[model samples]
Structures are given as structure tokens and as C-alpha cells.
Target: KVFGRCELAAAMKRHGLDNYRGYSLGNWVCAAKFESNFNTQATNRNTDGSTDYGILQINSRWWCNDGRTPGSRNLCNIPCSALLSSDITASVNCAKKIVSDGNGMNAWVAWRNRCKGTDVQAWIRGCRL
Candidate 1:
């Protein structure tokens, strides 16, 4: 579990991550440290009292299969529903968009770059695939 900073960066690379600092590994870690404290199991409360679930703080309101979606808000399942404003795979792609929107990792991308590492665990504390 102690993949540390450098190893995690490599994992992101393996996944062909979308967001980055000038496409450099340096900036990814910068954002990661802020978002979750690199904790995969990070859970927190939004100011409005919305419970953020899972590593990326997936909001219940926006969570598919959580009764908030078309079928039912209480219904929760992967491949069942997606964030209303995001892709089936939200956080990762969202992060990427934050970094590169056709520019390929620009200075503006690093402005609020909040996720880092090469793999999922690097962004949070968990074993990689």
C-alpha cells in the first residue's frame, strides 16, 4: 500500500490519464494531495449535508441507482446510472477535462488540478489493479 508519490504517478500513466500539468507528472501529485488526502476511502459531508461517497466523493444526489436517478434514488449500482452532468466514468474524465480540453495539459489545467498519481490508488489509498 506504500506505493508512495513516485510509484503512484506511474500508475496514472499506465491508465493513460487525461489530466496533468503540461503533461508532466509533477502537477498531478500537486492536485491529488488536496482533494482526498490521497485516501481512496475518503468520505466527507458537503456544506449542504450531502454525503459524499467513495474515493472521489461521489455525491448521492448525483449518484446513479441511488434513487436520485430515473429508476430510483435508493437504487444504487454501477453501470446502472451515471452522474447527471458527467460521464459514466465521472471523476477521471472530469479531472482530465480540467487539465486538457484539447490543449493537452496547459497551465490553466493545473490551476485547480486536485487529483494526482499514475493510478487510482495514487489519487487515493488503495491497491492498484
Candidate 2:
């Protein structure tokens, strides 16, 4: 359980999110390739003047605006779960819950699904190693 002496890489793999040393590069290259160009440094500024952050493209403005604990948090040490309670599963499950709820207003899903074919299965397949 102690991944590479408490490193993020092995911790990432243990969460079933990766199989390589790259924490999220594989997703950026495969699934999110054409979208945000897999740029971890990328961000989406809302009209109201808030911004998303990180490779997962997490919207801190929304998180904080919505009064979630991590909404105000912007740190490298905090994992995705700290924001959504899914812990390590946050990256995959956070948006998934919204998508699964069958509501069209899923913010995270909407952010990524700019084009046609709303099915994220393709993204998952592409991301799978």
C-alpha cells in the first residue's frame, strides 16, 4: 500500500487510474487528447469569473462556489477525492455520478463533452491500458 515510499505515481496506479509512471498523462494523451489537449495546465474561465484547475481540469470556482470543502482548496497535496469524497475514485466517479444521474446539466461532463456522441465509454476505452 505504501507506493514507492508515498509517491503519487504508484498511488495513482493503485487506484486503477494508471499503469505507468505518468499520473495522468495517459488520459491527456488518449481520452482527452482532442478536447483540452490533455493539458494539465489548462483551465476554463467562467463568465462569472471563476476557473478550473489541474490535469483533471477540476473547477475550483464551482467547487468553492458550491460551498464544497475543496471548493476553496487549491493544492497539489490534495487528491480528487478530498473534493468529492470518492477519495482516489474521485477522478473517475465525480463526473460519473452526474452523468449517471441522467441529468443533462452535469457540469464536469458538459465541460468535456463539447462534441457529439455523449458516450464517455470511448474515452474510457481510449484511456484503458
Candidate 3:
């Protein structure tokens, strides 16, 4: 809710994401664009009754609590509502954890299907940072 490519790149840099977990800023941008179009309040309800949350579209299945599901692993231990906030701190931290779990960007189907093996430099085009 608070960024375009340039602004997002700048904000992410300020948040120390330029090389987060060895993943480049471009990778993050590409994944995020497809995941939630950088919308912090975005959510996607899956057919399996789980949902994805926020800019990263983090899954309710194992990341955060969506309330409806009572036994989520909740690795991030934050409420799903936290991910849906204008501030992306919780979401970003959760994403770091997810990526560190060894999935990297492959954790997101959107990243796999839309950004992987493609020319991803365009994701940072016109971005000043």
C-alpha cells in the first residue's frame, strides 16, 4: 500500500533487504510483484480453506494464524492481521524466516510460475536503489 518500484526498492533497502538471505533485491521485487502486487493489505483465500496474506502473500497453512484454522504451525507467531497491515515489518520478518527455511523464492508459486527463469531485471527498472 505504500510503494511503487522505486519507493519499494528504497524502502526495502532501508530495511536491509538488498541482499536478504543471499537473495537479491530484484528477486524480492519480482516475487513480491506477482505475490501481491506489493499490496500490504492483500489476501488470497485458497480452495483448501487456507489463505495467503500481505505483500508476500504468506500462507496461513504454516506461517500465520488466520483464526479459522486453529492448529497452524504459525512459525512467525504473528496474527494474519499483522501481515495485512500498512507496515510490512512483520511480514518481511516472516518472509525472511520462510526463505531461510531453504525454499528461497520457490516458496511462492507466483514466484516460480511468473518470475523464475525469466528476465527479472525489469522488476528493478526505474528503481533508484
Candidate 4:
């Protein structure tokens, strides 16, 4: 499922992503916008044989166990398929863990390239959160 902008904002907020680890809701929304365009089932194969999954693009190499990525840490201790669900609870939880792991939001390159140090207000300007 592809989320509308406000819908995605609301969902992320519900999952306590607003101001999570000092990153604003707009930052999370903006990251998702560039990462997966809010698609629940998004996936990206990287050059290192790892794949990123779901709206937030949790990685298989270190975050989730896809069973295909050798030497996977499975730091989130979940199947990669869990990140692809539209419910997003697992994705949100794993994302929180990622942030807590000292990576901050920089775990996602999209956030670094597109959301970091930017006026991300536009990502949630009209949202009623």
C-alpha cells in the first residue's frame, strides 16, 4: 500500500516517531518520501547483495534476516518480510531500535541526503497531527 502524505504522517506519529530520538515527524516523513515513496512493499537491492525493505527501507544486511544475505546481523531479530507489512508496527519498532543503536536517523542515507538540515516542515505542513 502507498500512503498519502498526511496519512503517512499520522501513522508515523501513532508509532511514536514524532520527535523520536530528536528527529521531527517531518524528518521521518521526508525520509520515507525519498526512501520508498510511502510504499509498504518497497525493496531495493544493493551492490553488496543486501536488500532494503519496506517504507523505511530497513536493511537485510544488518537489520533484518532475509536468509539470503550472508553474515546478516539481524539486529532487529525479525524476518525481512515483517518490514513489508502495511501495518508498519514492526517497521516502526525496528526503526526505533536502529535509531537507538547510535546511528540516529543517519542509518538511512535518504534521510542524510534529503532530510538532514533541511526545512522539513513541508512534509507535514497540512497534517492535523
Query: Candidates 1 and 2: which is better by TM-score?
Result: 1
Local distance difference test, each candidate: 0.42, 0.39, 0.84, 0.94
Cα TM-score per model: 0.44, 0.38, 0.92, 0.97
Per-residue lDDT tens digits of candidate 3, residues 28-54? 888888888889888889988889999
As for lDDT, the candidate ahead, 1 or 3, is 3
Model 4 — which ten-residue stretch has the worst lDDT? 99-108
- Residue 9 miss distance in model 3 (angstroms): 1.5
lDDT of 2 by residue, 1-129 (tens): 111212323334465554322223233223333423444345565565555543344555433233444335432334433433323345433433333444423244433455234443344343223
Off by over 4 Å in 2: 1-14, 17-31, 64-105, 109-128
lDDT (10s digit) by residue, model 4, range 1-129: 999999999999999999998998999999999999999999999999999999999999999999999998999989999999989999999999998888799989999998999999889998898
- In model 1, the Cα lDDT at residue 6 comes to 52
The TM-score of candidate 1 is 0.44
Candidates in order: C-alpha RMSD to true structure: 8.7, 9.5, 1.3, 0.7
Model 4 residue 24 lDDT score: 89
lDDT of 4 at 10: 98
lDDT of 2: 0.39
lDDT (tens digit, per residue) of candidate 1 on 1-129: 223555545555564563344555444444444444444445555565455443234455434334433433432343222333222244444445435445443322222454333343334344242
- Sorting all predicted structures by lDDT, with the top scorer first, yields 4, 3, 1, 2
On lDDT, the candidate that comes out on top is 4
